[PDB]
Design a protein around this ligand. Structure first.
Ligand code: ATP
Ligand code: ATP
Ligand code: CA
Ligand code: ZN
Ligand code: ZN
Lengths: 738, 146, 48, 49
């Protein structure tokens, strides 16, 4: 509100804030020397945080060289004598926390309870010249130190860390905003230098989002990134998902929909971290149930290692199977026993017998782990897509599925179910769509279609041998099972387990697991994908080759029948071409595997009244098949493989010249050293936008700032106009007001 | 220097110095670098080829054992595929140096109640190995050099 | 090259305007900007 | 990195590098926050005494 902001700007608020800063700076030092009024100190720090929040709110929509920013910097330089004490109070305790636990400080402690033995704390702090005399005296005073030496550094260092974290972060954000808005002011450089110890501490936590502002201009947004939100973002199972998301968006994402896909990916990875949250190690009938729940987490949290173990087992089984031998007699008609060639040790057969069992056990464990790990993700994605199709672009009320996709028809089953949004966060999608489309269309018919209780029953919010056998949603379970069975990975794992079971019937069925799992590696995965990449062309080229061979077969059958003789034993004839099927099979089987076409296998036509015709026949067969169609097929496969490998590098090299959010990447921002790196790591960072989304989701609606409320409202209605267009706050303000 | 010393023990050890220093020139230096350029792909493609031919060896050992005869002297059998190691070695050694796959070396399946199965076996061996995997390896090497 | 010429024509539109020349270096600064310039102002079907 | 640790605490560590006073520079740069005696022992130079 511009009017109220100017009203507080032109008022007596600044004097009140100056007095508050003075009293707070003095009381922070006074209250820390006894450790008895700790609650009063915590409340004082909370009030300081509230004041800093008010000051930050005063700078919501300020122009780069705004009047309010200059008034605030004048206010700070007026009361520098207390701001310095506040900053020193933060920095001294941060440095004390850093020093305690190091090696130089630990070189002075000799007691076996963890006591520095005051009168050597001063020496320890003076060995490393960081503080001064009064600072060390203040630190000594703030310690407990009974019996003349009992300073417990473990609690002394951590006593003032937690209470002062919020106020420290808030003042760091305020200083960063003021410095970044009015940079041509030497009166703030000293403040920045004196606050370098807290500014560098909250470097990984301080976010920085640039958005399209409320009225017409780009605005920068500062927030807090939780330590857990960044620890789970650096998990190995997150970077590859991000890379896959960029691969898909860059290649087959196009434009005008990149932001929607990005937001969907943000929600998907939020659900991924939600799944990973309960997968961590700490996490009569009841004991068995809790033991089973604990057991069904080692497989899920450690699932790829089970795949590697299955691969190793398959390789060992195949290496053992390499020693098989066949003979007409047992080792001790048409017997043909398949016994084993025990070279020097008789333990090979028991090893094979055991490995056959552990392979099946590992396959079952792998499929269970996949069921408990990656199935909720696809269920959540399907439910979210269905809900957002229902409530925004209604597909089963206004429109109808086109009967060409089985997904739309199958998604009609999960409707009218008491537990339709079992994985999606939004449990009130039914009420939303009822209130959105229940007026133009039949309210009763919509309630019947969605299966929810009518307004008569659920008007407002006025307010395990039996549970697992009676409280089961049969329709929802059928729909979920269909969705799971449609998944490619689940089908592959089911086939793996089925053939592992079949390998007990015959030991040679374990050979397919040698090939089917070796493709899980990165390099060999595209080799098979190349075959199906040109799928609509391979089959058609092979059909053209077959048609050409058929035409040559017809020509040979009609005229050159006498030449196709393949035996000389006085039972001569052995006519390969005396039947159209036999002639076609002869031409297809060996007419293309020969290096010179069909002419190599048939007899010579020298002086047979058809020499020129058969010479033309052979030459044109060779030229048209061997050196043309086979070359075309080879080129198709190799070119598909090459383009598949090149698309994996185009997306890796496209970012290095373009910006993923605001468009132009490096033709305007690389004019300064590390310019692209700065524009990526400070202003426009996709991970930072994801963190902002998580922060908005976690934050209460009553605590939202004006910009936060604006962004949240646009997100709830699925409008992405707040994402930066071809502007980055530097083409507008930093172009002239640098 | 070590192999120069060893060349006095046997005079034929001086032959390697003909090759090892001829690559010091600019043009031939990248020929060797091409092989190690796609090092993480060449070994893996060769392993895929070995696995595929191993599957074909398993199939031949189980069903088409009677066809792998390579001698006619009244000491006939000479069974190439009567041991998994021997069958695999036969498929490795001459199943890929042949221009038409393994079908060129084995006897004809004409009228042996398995004619279509063995025809499919030979055709798919030829197509999947000779004109696909060898071409992929060749393309990898030549593209790395280019 | 015959297969590639069938793909070059399918990607020249996405950066150039069929009528007035410049297609996307001046009109895509706004979201759906190229789509708007194609579907509202310069549409060949509309000229037909 | 592990093999470079042997060349430390050597009387003639910068035998080819021009800067023969890198040990003194790093001692004066990091000898206060960390142990001066331990840094001198690690770099093998004679103490200030
Ligand atoms: N918001 C962004 N705008 C533009 N480019 C970006 C953005 N975020 C990332 N990039 C690009 O991505 C690069 C860094 O991210 P990327 O994940 O590609 O690499 P990386 O950090 O080395 O990989 P990783 O962390 O996945 O192992 C940047 O140098 C830049 O080219
Ligand atoms: N007047 C125009 N100026 C510039 N580009 C145009 C114009 N008309 C069409 N285009 C291009 O063509 C695209 C849409 O037409 P196009 O026929 O190529 O695709 P389509 O509508 O998906 O196909 P179709 O209707 O033939 O199945 C636009 O996105 C744009 O790239
Ligand atoms: Ca509020
Ligand atoms: Zn940008
Ligand atoms: Zn135009």
């Amino acid at each position: 509100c511009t009017g109220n902001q100017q009203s507080l700007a032109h008022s007596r608020l600044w004097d009140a804030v100056v007095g508050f800063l003075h009293v707070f700076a003095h009381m922070m030092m006074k209250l820390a020397q006894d450790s008895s009024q700790i609650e009063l100190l915590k409340e004082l720090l909370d009030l300081q945080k509230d004041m800093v929040v008010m000051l930050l709110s005063l700078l919501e929509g300020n122009v780069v060289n705004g009047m309010i920013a200059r008034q605030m910097v004048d206010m700070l330089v007026e009361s520098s004598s207390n701001v310095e004490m506040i900053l020193k109070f933060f920095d001294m305790f941060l440095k004390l926390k850093d020093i305690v636990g190091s090696e130089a400080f630990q070189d002075y402690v000799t007691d076996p309870r963890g006591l520095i033995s005051k009168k050597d704390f001063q020496k320890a702090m003076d060995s490393q010249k960081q503080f001064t005399g009064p600072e060390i005296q203040f630190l000594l005073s703030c310690s407990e130190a009974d019996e003349n030496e009992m300073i417990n550094f473990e609690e002394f260092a951590n006593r003032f860390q937690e209470p002062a974290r919020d106020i420290g972060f808030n003042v760091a954000v305020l200083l960063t905003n003021l410095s970044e808005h009015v940079p041509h002011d030497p009166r703030l450089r000293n403040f920045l230098e004196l606050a370098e110890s807290i500014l560098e501490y909250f470097r990984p936590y301080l976010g920085r989002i640039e958005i399209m502002g409320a009225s017409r201009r780009i605005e920068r947004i500062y927030f807090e990134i939780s330590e857990t939100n960044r620890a789970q973002w650096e998990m190995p199972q997150v970077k590859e998902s991000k890379r896959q998301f960029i691969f898909d968006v860059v290649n087959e994402g196009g434009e005008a929909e990149k932001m929607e896909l990005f937001v969907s990916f943000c929600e998907d990875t939020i659900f991924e971290m939600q799944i990973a949250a309960q997968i961590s190690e700490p996490e009569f009938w009841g004991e068995l149930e809790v033991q089973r729940v604990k057991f069904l987490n080692y497989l899920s949290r450690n699932f790829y290692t089970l795949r590697f173990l299955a691969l190793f087992l398959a390789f060992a089984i195949n290496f053992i199977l390499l020693f098989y031998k066949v003979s007409d007699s047992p080792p001790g008609d048409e017997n043909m026993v398949y016994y084993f060639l025990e070279e020097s040790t008789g333990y090979m057969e028991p090893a094979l017998w055991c490995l056959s069992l552990l392979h099946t056990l590992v396959a079952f464990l792998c499929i269970i782990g996949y069921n408990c790990l990656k199935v909720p993700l696809v269920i959540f994605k399907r439910e979210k897509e269905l809900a957002r199709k229902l409530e925004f672009d209604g597909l089963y009320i206004t429109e109808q599925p086109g009967d060409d996709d089985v997904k739309g028809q199958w998604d009609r089953l999960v409707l009218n179910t008491p537990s339709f949004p079992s994985n999606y966060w939004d449990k009130f999608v039914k009420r939303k769509v009822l209130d959105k489309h229940g007026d133009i269309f039949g309210r009763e018919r919509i309630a019947e279609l969605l299966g929810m209780d009518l307004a008569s029953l659920e008007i407002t919010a006025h307010n395990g041998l039996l549970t697992w056998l009676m409280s089961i949603d049969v329709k929802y379970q059928i729909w979920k099972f269909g969705v799971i069975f449609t998944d490619n990975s689940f089908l592959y794992l089911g086939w793996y387990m089925v053939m592992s079971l079949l390998g007990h019937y015959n030991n040679f069925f374990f050979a397919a697991h040698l090939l089917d799992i070796a493709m899980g590696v990165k390099t060999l995965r595209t080799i098979l994908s190349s075959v199906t990449h040109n799928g609509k062309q391979l089959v058609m080229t092979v059909g053209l080759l077959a048609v050409v061979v058929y035409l040559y077969t017809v020509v040979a059958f009609n005229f050159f029948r006498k030449f196709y003789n393949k035996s000389e034993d006085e039972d001569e004839p052995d006519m390969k071409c005396d039947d159209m099927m036999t002639c076609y099979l002869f031409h297809m089987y060996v007419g293309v595997r020969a290096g010179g076409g069909i002419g190599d296998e048939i007899e010579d036509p020298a002086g047979d009244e058809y020499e020129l015709y058969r010479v033309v026949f052979d030459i044109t067969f060779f030229f048209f098949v061997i050196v043309i169609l086979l070359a075309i097929i080879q080129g198709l496969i190799i070119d598909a493989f090459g383009e598949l490998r090149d698309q994996q590098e185009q997306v890796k090299e496209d970012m290095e010249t373009k910006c993923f959010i605001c468009g132009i990447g490096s033709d305007y921002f690389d004019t300064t050293p590390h310019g692209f790196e700065t524009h990526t790591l400070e202003e426009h960072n996709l991970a930072n936008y994801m963190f902002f989304l998580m922060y908005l989701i976690n934050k209460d609606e009553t605590e939202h700032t004006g910009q936060e409320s604006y962004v949240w409202k646009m997100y709830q209605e699925r409008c992405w106009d707040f994402f930066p267009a071809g502007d980055c706050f530097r083409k507008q303000y930093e172009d002239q007001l640098s």
